Amino acid sequence: GMQFHIDDMTCGGCASTVKKTILTLDANATVRTDPATRLVDVETSLSAEQIAAALQKAGFPPRER
Structure with missing residues (x-):
């Protein structure tokens, strides 16, 4: 299990x-x-880095928890 916080994920649609x-x-x-x-x-x-790299490229830079 990996977990991120995604500050830009501010609604259902970002999700x-x-x-x-x-x-x-x-x-x-x-x-x-x-x-x-x-x-x-x-x-x-x-x-986690591969996942984060993809999320960043999509405009949803995460922080791993």
């Missing part, structure tokens, strides 16, 4: 973009997003 970004990178990933806390939980064989 969709975050989730689709991750799923396009790794179709086997599990992703949970919570707009109330701006927290994103990911299960993936990829590294």
Whole structure:
């Protein structure tokens, strides 16, 4: 389990973009997003840096928790 806080993920629709970004990178990933806390939980064989790099490129720079 890796977890990020995503300050820019400020609504449901940003959350969709975050989730689709991750799923396009790794179709086997599990992703949970919570707009109330701006927290994103990911299960993936990829590294936290690879996930973050993708999220950054999408305009949702995260901080790993």
